[PDB]
Design a protein around this ligand. Structure first.
Ligand SMILES: C[C@H](N)C(=O)N[C@@H](C)P(=O)(O)O
Ligand SMILES: [Zn+2]
Length: 455
């Protein structure tokens, strides 16, 4: 009976991320192509949205576990997400229409993501090794879903734009997101009834919905106003750095210092990882050309889940059987390093103004493999000496915005359309970032003896 209970929760996650990534691939292009955003702001706005999205399940996790139901909060978040993309199907209107929609997605995410995952931790089966195996199948469930989205939505965006100019076009794609949610939540979520935590308090339901609407407003204001989010992130940074400042204040130092390095490396990693949704997505837009009527530049992001699915069974194959396998951080950075250098040396070979189509295929292959290697991100993994549920998680949220400030180094002015000139600024970033990625590789191994010391 464990199988059925896991199958449903996995299918809802599949369609949820279908809608989510189906939106992610296109949103930054939407701000640039349909709306008139410059890559500078487009990167910042999307990256602040990502920061909020990452940091969202913090509040909502506690909501489903202590305030309302786990299954109920999950279902609620899914409906909120549904109305989130529902808001994305209306034309242009005030710019504030989108920011609000994003804010709704923020809130929806926070109520779905942690609880849907909590169910997998609970049912099938609960306090067993099976959990780790389960979360991998669940991990794959995301990748299969986000595949069909990141391939269909830009294709539907392109196709509908050809039949009817501007509207729906992009909004047709956002409607695809919407109906995806209405497919997962609309079917699978009510097909089975599994046991959760609370199982509804109307006073608590109300106070939650009110605060959720308010959070949509507050998110919209941080997204629209560039400087506001900048201050919000800065404040969050002084916060995280302060917590670590109090934690370190002889024997505990061996773990804490290591954790401090780990968290910053995690921060570093998220920076690299955001590039593909930002700067690398923009680089790919200034090269729609594809060899391998199709194929759209946003479709390049789909390489990520596709590569993960094909490299996963390769990595699971192990001849081993030990301890301090934190060297996988270094390898990861190292593999990310050459990935960026692929884009770095893209300007040299295969260029007709600005070409290199396969450069994205092999590049993303390297990104996905590096992401695959740093799977043990766990906040408890760094906690060897317990304020990591905050400081670390928040730091990992802050980093998402930092990825946009780093993407901004490759921001092409709106008046610059000549691909022969856009190419170098992108490669110069990618060539720099690869080098920076080697620096972390060194960092990861320099901190290795500190992991050897505590054990
Ligand atoms: C599909 C994508 N590569 C992925 O696995 N994402 C998970 C880490 P998330 O959907 O929880 O961010
Ligand atoms: Zn170089």
């Amino acid at each position: 009976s464990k199988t059925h209970s896991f199958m449903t929760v996995s299918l809802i996650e599949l369609w949820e991320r279908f809608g989510y990534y189906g939106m992610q691939a296109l949103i930054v292009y939407f701000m640039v192509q349909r709306l008139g955003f410059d890559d500078s702001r487009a990167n910042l706005v999307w990256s602040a949205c990502a920061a909020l999205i990452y940091v969202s399940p913090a509040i909502g996790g506690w909501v489903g576990d202590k305030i309302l139901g786990t299954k109920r909060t999950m279902l609620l978040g899914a409906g909120i997400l549904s109305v989130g993309y529902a808001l994305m199907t209306v034309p242009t209107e005030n710019t504030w229409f989108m920011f609000s929609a994003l804010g709704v997605i923020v809130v929806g995410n926070g109520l779905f993501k942690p609880n849907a995952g909590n169910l997998v931790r609970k049912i099938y089966e609960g306090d067993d090794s099976k959990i780790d195996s389960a979360f991998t199948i669940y991990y794959m469930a995301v990748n299969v879903g986000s595949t069909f989205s990141m391939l269909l939505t830009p294709w539907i965006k392109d196709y509908v734009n050809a039949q009817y100019g501007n509207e729906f076009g992009w909004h047709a794609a956002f409607a695809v997101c919407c109906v995806g949610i209405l497919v997962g939540l609309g079917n699978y979520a009510l097909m089975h009834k599994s046991l959760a935590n609370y199982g509804v308090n109307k006073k608590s339901l109300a106070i939650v919905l009110a605060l959720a609407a308010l959070s949509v407003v507050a998110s919209a204001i941080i997204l629209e106003y560039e400087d506001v989010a900048r201050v919000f992130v800065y404040a969050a940074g002084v916060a995280v750095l302060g917590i670590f400042f109090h934690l370190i204040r002889p024997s505990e130092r061996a773990g804490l210092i290591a954790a401090l390095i780990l968290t910053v490396q995690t921060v570093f990693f998220f920076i690299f990882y955001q590039q593909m949704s930002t700067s690398l997505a923009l680089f790919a837009l200034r090269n729609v050309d594809w060899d391998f009527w199709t194929w759209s530049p946003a479709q390049f992001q789909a390489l990520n889940p596709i590569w993960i699915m094909v490299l996963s069974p390769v990595l699971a194959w192990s001849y081993s059987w030990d301890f301090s396998i934190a060297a996988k951080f270094a390898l990861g950075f190292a593999v990310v390093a050459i990935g960026f250098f692929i884009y770095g040396f893209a300007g040299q070979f295969a260029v007709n103004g600005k070409t290199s189509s396969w450069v994205m295929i092999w590049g993303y292959a390297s990104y996905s493999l590096g992401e695959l290697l740093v799977s043990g991100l766990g906040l408890a993994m760094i906690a060897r000496y317990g304020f990591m549920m905050g400081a670390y998680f928040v730091a990992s949220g802050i980093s998402q915005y930092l990825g946009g400030v780093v993407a901004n180094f490759a921001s092409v002015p709106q008046d610059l359309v000549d691909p022969l000139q856009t190419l170098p600024v992108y490669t110069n970033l990618f060539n720099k970032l690869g080098v920076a990625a080697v620096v972390c590789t060194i960092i990861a191994l320099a901190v290795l003896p500190l992991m050897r010391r505590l054990t």
